[PDB]
Design a protein around this nucleic acid. Sequence first.
RNA 1: AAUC
RNA 2: AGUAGUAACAAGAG
RNA 3: UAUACCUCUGCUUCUGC
Lengths: 100, 336, 7, 17, 732, 750
Amino acid sequence: AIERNLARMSPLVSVTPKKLTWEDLRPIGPHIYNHELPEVPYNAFLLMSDELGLANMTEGKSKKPKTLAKECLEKYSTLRDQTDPILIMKSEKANENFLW
Amino acid sequence: QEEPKIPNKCRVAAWVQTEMNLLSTLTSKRALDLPEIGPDVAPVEHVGSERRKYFVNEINYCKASTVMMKYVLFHTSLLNESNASMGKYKVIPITNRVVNEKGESFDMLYGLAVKGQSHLRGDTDVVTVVTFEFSSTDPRVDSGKWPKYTVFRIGSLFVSGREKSVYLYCRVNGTNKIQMKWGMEARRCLLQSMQQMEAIVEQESSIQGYDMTKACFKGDRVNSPKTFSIGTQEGKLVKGSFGKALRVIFTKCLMHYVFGNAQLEGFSAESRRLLLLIQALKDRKGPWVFDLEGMYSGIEECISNNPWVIQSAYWFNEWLGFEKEGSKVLESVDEI
Amino acid sequence: SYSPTSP
Amino acid sequence: YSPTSPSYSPTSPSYSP
Amino acid sequence: GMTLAKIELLKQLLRDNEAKTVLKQTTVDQYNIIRKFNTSRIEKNPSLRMKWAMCSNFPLALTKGDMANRIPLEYKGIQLKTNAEDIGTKGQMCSIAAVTWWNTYGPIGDTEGFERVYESFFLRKMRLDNATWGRITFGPVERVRKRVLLNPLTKEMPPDEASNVIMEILFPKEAGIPRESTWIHRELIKEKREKLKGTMITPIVLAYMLERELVARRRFLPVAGATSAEFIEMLHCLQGENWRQIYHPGGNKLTESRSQSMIVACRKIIRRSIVASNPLELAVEIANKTVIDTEPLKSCLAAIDGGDVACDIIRAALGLKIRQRQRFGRLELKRISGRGFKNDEEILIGNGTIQKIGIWDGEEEFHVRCGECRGILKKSKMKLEKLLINSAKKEDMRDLIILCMVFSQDTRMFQGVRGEINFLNRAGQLLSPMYQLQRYFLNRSNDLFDQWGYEESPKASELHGINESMNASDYTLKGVVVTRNVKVSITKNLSLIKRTGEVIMGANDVSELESQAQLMITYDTPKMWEMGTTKELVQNTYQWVLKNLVTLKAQFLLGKEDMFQWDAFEAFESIIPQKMAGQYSGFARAVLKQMRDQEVMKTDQFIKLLPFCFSPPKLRSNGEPYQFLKLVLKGGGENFIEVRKGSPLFSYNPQTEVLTICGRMMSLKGKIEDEERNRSMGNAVLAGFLVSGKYDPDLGDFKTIEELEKLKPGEKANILLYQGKPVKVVKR
Amino acid sequence: GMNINPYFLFIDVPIQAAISTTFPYTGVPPYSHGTGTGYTIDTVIRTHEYSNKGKQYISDVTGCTMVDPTNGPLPEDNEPSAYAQLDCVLEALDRMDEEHPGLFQAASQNAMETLMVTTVDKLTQGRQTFDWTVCRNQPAATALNTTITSFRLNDLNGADKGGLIPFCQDIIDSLDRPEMTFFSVKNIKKKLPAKNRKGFLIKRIPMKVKDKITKVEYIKRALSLNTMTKDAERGKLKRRAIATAGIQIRGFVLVVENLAKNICENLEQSGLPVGGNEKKAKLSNAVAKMLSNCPPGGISMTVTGDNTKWNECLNPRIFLAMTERITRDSPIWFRDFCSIAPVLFSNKIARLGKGFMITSKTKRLKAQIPCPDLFSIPLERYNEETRAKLKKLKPFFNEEGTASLSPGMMMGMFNMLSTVLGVAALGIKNIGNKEYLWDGLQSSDDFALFVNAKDEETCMEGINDFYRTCKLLGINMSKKKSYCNETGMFEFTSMFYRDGFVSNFAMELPSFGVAGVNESADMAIGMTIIKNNMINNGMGPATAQTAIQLFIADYRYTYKCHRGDSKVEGKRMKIIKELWENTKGRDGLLVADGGPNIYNLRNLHIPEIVLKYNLMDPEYKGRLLHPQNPFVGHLSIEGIKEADITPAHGPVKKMDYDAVSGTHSWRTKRNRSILNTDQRNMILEEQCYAKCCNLFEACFNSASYRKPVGQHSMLEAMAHRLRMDARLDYESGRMSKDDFEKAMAHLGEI
RNA sequence: AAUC
RNA sequence: AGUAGUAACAAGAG
RNA sequence: UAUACCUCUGCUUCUGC
Ligand SMILES: *O=P([O])([O])OP([O])(=O)O[C][C]1O[C]([N+]2=[C]N([C])C3=C2N=C([N])[N]C3=O)[C]([O])[C]1[O]
């Protein structure tokens, strides 16, 4: 029956195979090289390489997060007591005033 | 019924490369909070201890290691507030405990964050978090990196000697119960990287018949240090240490989380099929295909607006080109 | 004890 | 000898003239 | 007065309309359906839900009792529990702080007979406590995936048999129909009761802990020379792929387990010693320094009364009396007279299939035994003749007759196989065809007797036969009778000879079965790598070639062929089928000479073949050596060294100059000639054959090994090295 | 500047050796948001898209639109095809019986004999099941109970007999009933006396009401499948839909699957139902033989294969034919039994989830549109994507808001039986006596075909035949995902081969974290996962020791149980710090009580409570392991040893661990969302059964251990026991004359 | 010298 | 807004 | 309407083999 069916079945049905040669492997993602599209933005939850930690040498004991964040800002008082907003970059749909 | 919003198409961006190159690099600051362990008795545990002294510290003393420990410790506290103080708006700090070469606990603060109302019923239900983060980076330099961010100048610091201006990157972001949990379990980035390289240490330890850890990293009497193809220099390959090749994977494993979504999974899955077909040609196992263009459409429809996917697509095309050049050495073998 | 290096 | 040392490995079969 | 309370609590319940109807309508079978009834959905992310739930105020649920009320509502300004009751427990909900409180300031409970209840676990610790650790060795380890026992048991039983024993200990009255199993394990039941007497722990916990130390936990694990449970429990610290660690587990070890490892140890020694000139000298060397866990092989062979052919051969070589005592499960035989020879036959069975079984020829006599009962047995090639036995238990005499019939390999026994038997494993592995048939007829014995035959009893002084029912009857089984009464020297090539020059055992009499040990076999000899497995020896050998490739390649190119026969390559020969070993050497020695003489050298191919050139060579009739496509080795379809191509064992990458030996990658950079990168393989692929030009369409299709061997010198031919590399080669 | 590229590792190390680094399992898996109706309808359309050239007819039973592809016209394109010819299946099945002699009748016997022994409670051990009574998914144990109680009203007490056969006999009979009545609890007010101003209070009591449905309605509900979307499905961009089965169908599937399972075990070229090391052991030998048996001076090629649209093509009517062939020697009662499950799937109905949500962005409003009200709205308000789908659904759509899905295997469930149909293709081995020999492996949809022939030109022609052979069974090979290469390396069910199956640590990585059972259980699980990965998935001692470190971290933060000497602030940590000061043997304290972590590579297999028992204070160990502590509760035989684990590949299999039952072995509060819904009434229903069962366990202690047997009344059992207990205690002298008469008096009333 |  | 990505959440209910 | 700046809820508005 299988013999009879593979006989009467259309040759169009096939895996149509081809041996792979290196120059068949065209580079993946043609669009990512096109400059018409916009540069992909940073969309990570926190900052990574660009991050900047304020060093506050501890008394070798664990403290509450609020107290820690306090003492860390107590040292860097110049930044903690900067009440004057000097805007540099603004997000398309954001509020300079509310954020600050 | 409104039309569904589709991820828009982006192009390659250098900041992803730059992130990779920097996160890989070594520092003088150990972040990882690796707790105590039982005492060593079995000689396997004594080898296991030594192997770590090289493997762990190679990660610990790198940039990615601290960034990872930040995300974990933040996502930990952020989830704790989200359940405890559901109705209350709370100011959560971006804490991280660090230890220097001399051995002193330097508590860091990368900025302040604000968690909104967190009545999170479903796992996918979103709690809006607003991030205010310190930075030495001028956003005008690479403008196209920070469409989402809003930056203020808030003073200056003389960290090196030059008056390096301190900025404040402000952004309205969002997380959910799942991401916050998967964040707390981002320490397992160590294991995926450490095993992969301990395997190569074992493989080589078999051949020389002694612990080739010390030998692989730096080298000893008989054996010189292991070296890997690691990166490019204006279109010409460069070699790097085992210690670097370790960190490059550890970084990748962290980026897998930091840019983890449906776009990455779909790409990672379909791109393996091509990675194997390439290995077949490298092994000279005459590989055959039935529909390549169809197999490509599967890989290419996963590239939209994931930084890591878009850069991995580039890196893959770069690596393919280098392997495509190496092929020319073989095609002219056993044909005299 | 180990202490890593780079270029 | 420590497992990290090259002298830890066994006195293997070496060839001689 | 517990009885009164239960009745009064049953009264209170039956006054409720809902409870009344439920207890009337629900059957004892249906109990298992109403118990699993609740509002609780299955949590398909318990990792998340827990981390979340832990950040709530009152995640936990207390059980409504006086002990729940012992907890205060708050402590030092901390909310321990809440007044609001849980839906499930019908009791006050509480925080994780409530747990920590209880463990700190809570009431001090009664921990009497805790170590006796949780014995199974404390033993597991006691084994690690009293254990001693050896030394870590770095080098290849071939790992086999065998079905092993995870945890050591107190006394092994099937699930059903243990379940009843547990019932008799904890829940006597519910137990039900008393089986014979009760009387068999009566001593264990009595012992467990006395140990679990003064304990407050919940029965369900005791049942669970007992079920652990009775029911078997057998699952597939990758192992290497350690199958004993007390090793398998430590399997993580025993060995990896590319490392090994010696570990002596404390407490006690079994005699059977020692005897098991004792055999494989000898079988491994002999199988290796066979190939070396003066095997005895090499066998004696290793045998002395061979260790089973801690006890040396000699001490084991001296202490244990039993083993196989291989054990006796070594026993003689060390200088000990040989116990010619073959064992077939429960059956323990001892040779009196005769000597049999194993031959693989295609035996047909009753159900309607064919199975390769190693049949034993010649007439022999054995002194059989099975528990309390004893006897003497005689048999011929696939037939039982005479079976004398004494009177003891009915079941011991019943089992002894079944074992002897299966042992005899009588064509009437195989005809009795009318059911289902598994000779192949679930994982496509092989199961011992004789040891499978023994298990079948032990339980289902009704077919065996019926399918055998019957005749009249013997009529002598003390000879009186027995029937199927095992009673002194007239119609006894065909060739069965019951009665009322019960130095050597070894050769150079490992053979046991009497004073009359009669050989009783040889090196071709030991089993060709390569099987895992139960305990850990440690060879206290610097050449211990030689006793290793195929893939272990293959890898270790090729490493020695590379370790001295400088001096080896040099002295060979000068002329000296003294490396061909080098200590290293002797161990490698013992994992070659000792039948084409010389023919391989014949081929390899020719192709190697054809590289240094012709000056078409290929260092990768030199390294590949040099190990095969230890065996004294064997050429064809007309002087030419044998030709090959691939060189086959002991065990597995994986193990071969393709000559024209690369193989799973040995492969070379020209591009990177990387040599992959059983997965492990070495580098041949700075050990290859610059001109060599061009030099074709066609020249060093067939002995007395060298490349002329490129594939000539005239000559026709590629020629077989046979077609290439039968060609007169100075005839051109077409060979295919590896897919898409045609060559035009001529005979020198 | 030096530009790092991570792929450049693949220059030094080959892909398979370092495949672990191509799996992003530190990241978050894809989840589904909102409805799954658009995903379900897509499946509904696509299932009929591959069967549209078959035979379309109207079911005289249901009155639905049915589609039959089987024995349809053969395809003239490479598009998926359900057009499987009956003869070509029967031939491939015959070929299997020839190659494996008397396996069918042998497998049928084993299953048939098991069916007789199988109890009704076997249907309790399942996941969320569709409950026809309330028309919502519920636990299998409840979904079963609701059906038994409902069947008792319509007068079908086959369940009471204890066997599954008479209960299955009731299910097929329940279709014949003209009306099917079922309880539907409805609230009633009731004044109760209290200490109020007006001394009383109103308590809304539940009252069971007898609600009926027609013959047709029940028949459809019985054939209905409830659809969702696959959440946490790895290595996939876009999402896909799945379905849950009813309590009726679940009975017959268990037998047919058990039947195919018996065949599969004995079949050589099957990856199921074997698993773990046993799976590798088989595939290794299979590969070794399939490698070393090949003709010398030829080429052995491995097709790393995969079938697309597996469930969407495979027809139940082919699966029906399979059972009839397998049960040919078995008796006529068993033939008809195995025939039901496929017959139900042949006329199955698909429930289209929740529906579609519509919103005005300006007004800022939203509202769910139920599936019955899909065509209530003009289709101009639905978006292009949904508009096209809803039009294509129309000729299959029912008024009650369901879709007639006669073709395909929406839910699946037939994995073992679907593997066999695959093996049957691998059994053929040749077509037209050509110069090739194929033979492969099968794990449901996943396959790996080996081909031994003269040259590669012949091999590919041999593969082309397999492709065209599989089309006649209803198996469509994925030209996209499937690829071929010379034997030596291949992929089969996320297992990567390269002259031996290579280690892939990233697959098992998610399991290393806190599983979330409880403190005492999660510790055991945590170490047992570490030690089992050192064995099976090749984790070196350095990474293994780090995996212990990284666990205690996740453990201490999750359960907020840091060391006593550490000064980390927290509600619990305050009492932990006092325990550290109070306790002398601080090494005896568990990690969950702010004690030190003493675990290493060697002692992973030993429980934490046992390791420290000798080092504990006499007071602390008393508290920790108090026999009558309130935290632990009524332990179930499964509740102590076993616990769920979800690996990223196969179904959720429950592994077993070793832990001591102490204060830390607690349970969490029940989800309290039920209190606000009308489902409240089930809380009373539960606590009612709870009382009965808990009182039964007080009479029969072995009930907790081994399943009680008996077709008699649950009260009758409790009566006779408590009668004897009282009589024997009196005659022995544990019971007094005062208590015995009172006992006999109370039992006298019953 | 296995099966369970 | 933002998260996010083929459909949701940006609190629900009495 | 109203109580309601009150009350309840955080997987139980469908998670299969
Ligand atoms: O372990 P083996 O491969 O050697 O095979 P098996 O199963 O027969 O081993 C059991 C033991 O019994 C001995 N045996 C078996 N038969 C039937 C005979 C013998 N020995 C002799 N002399 N005559 C027999 O007829 C095996 O030798 C083995 O020790």
